[PDB]
Amino acid sequence: GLYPSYNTSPAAPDSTGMQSTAVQLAGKIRLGWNIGNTMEAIGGETAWGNPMVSNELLKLVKDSGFDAVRIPVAWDQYANQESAEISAAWLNRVKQVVQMAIDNELYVLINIHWDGGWLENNITPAKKDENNAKQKAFWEQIATHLRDFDEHLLFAGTNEPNAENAEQMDVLNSYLQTFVDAVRSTGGKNAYRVLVLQGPVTDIEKTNELWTHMPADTATDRLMAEVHFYTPYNFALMRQDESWGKQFYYWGEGFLSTTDTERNPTWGEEATIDQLFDLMKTKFVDQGIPVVLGEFSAMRRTNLTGDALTLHLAGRAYYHKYVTQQALARGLLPFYWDNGGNDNFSSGIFNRQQNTVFDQQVLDALLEGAGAQ
């Protein structure tokens, strides 16, 4: 016992408001939005330039057409490092955000995010024991505090855990089992809450290769899998050229350049997207396990100008429409990664300071891709 038990008020199991299986719950979600660079920000909720989450933001998210939010959350920096006790004020703050999202009729996915790296970069035999202890202590606290929310609230145990081979995958499986066990131990509605488990690095190919089973669960058919998607890197995220490769500015059939053809993709186009999502359809969806596409987005390149900018924005928009549409077609639930930024190399579709739409072109792309428009 490195840390005290935080399973201090375990409750009678309660299935009130928790009647949906994972499959039934997934049917209710076609488009999600990540509250990025906010509650997981190192230094505090506003430390990465976004305002504190407001009811007004969550209202805008719902009214704009999203069914769900994924809320990355930081915890370690709020915790006593001797005892693993999380700040009561921070637990309450998280709870308040969850309540607002539910009040706006959104489904809500809470996680432990990168969180300074304590679990995420340490999927190793050397860290296994101490990290299982922290994973347990944190999840006991988070689940206890958020226990009374109905099925609008889902938990995700980890974010992008860095498991690179079969040995590290067994360590991740331990961490995921510790998560499910901690949640379930708290009882109440947590006996039946749908939980989301992350593939290795949330990478589709590594997950295909390394995944074995879901953690064992006392509940029936209450688990989903999670992967993320930023393929191809050169387009979605790459900010400078390297010896090994160039940034792609352009993407998608119809939106390629005839002049700067070195900025058209050399890989990662439509057929590759289909092939990757097909892997997750076979591995999970076809076995009765929904897949959360927990993050995707291709950043804006507003350092481009004139016709290059115009072309870039067209292919960027189409990329988001295409990923959304092809995900949904294969049982993957697409959650857009929004970092709140409206500047170069950002992904904010809302102006957080004014609760307005900044990037109507991407928003339209997502809604069209979801069949909402």
Author numbering: 96 to 468
Published text:
The highly up-regulated CJA_3010 encodes a signal peptidase II lipoprotein signal peptide (predicted by LipoP 1.0), followed by a serine-rich linker and a GH5_4 catalytic module, and was thus predicted to be anchored extracellularly in the outer membrane by N-terminal cysteine lipidation. Indeed CjGH5D, CjGH5E, and CjGH5F all displayed high specific activity toward XyG. The limit-digest products further revealed that all C. japonicus GH5_4 enzymes specifically catalyze hydrolysis at the anomeric position of the unbranched glucose residues of the (galacto)XyG polysaccharide chain. The overall structure of CjGH5D (residues Gly96 to Gln468) is an (β/α)8 barrel as is typical for GH5 family members.
In contrast, His6-GH5D was produced as a stable, intact, active protein (calculated mass, 44,222.2 Da; observed by ESI–MS, 44,222.6 Da) in excellent yield (150 mg L−1). Despite sequence identities in the 25–40% range, the structure is similar to the catalytic domains of many GH5 enzymes, most of which are annotated as xyloglucanases, glucanases and lichenases, with typical alignment values of approximately 310 residues aligning with an rmsd of 1.3 Å. For example, the structure used for molecular replacement, BoGH5A, overlaps with an r.m.s.d. of 1.1 Å over 332 equivalent Cα atoms with 40% identity. Minor differences are observed between the two structures in loops at the end of core helices.
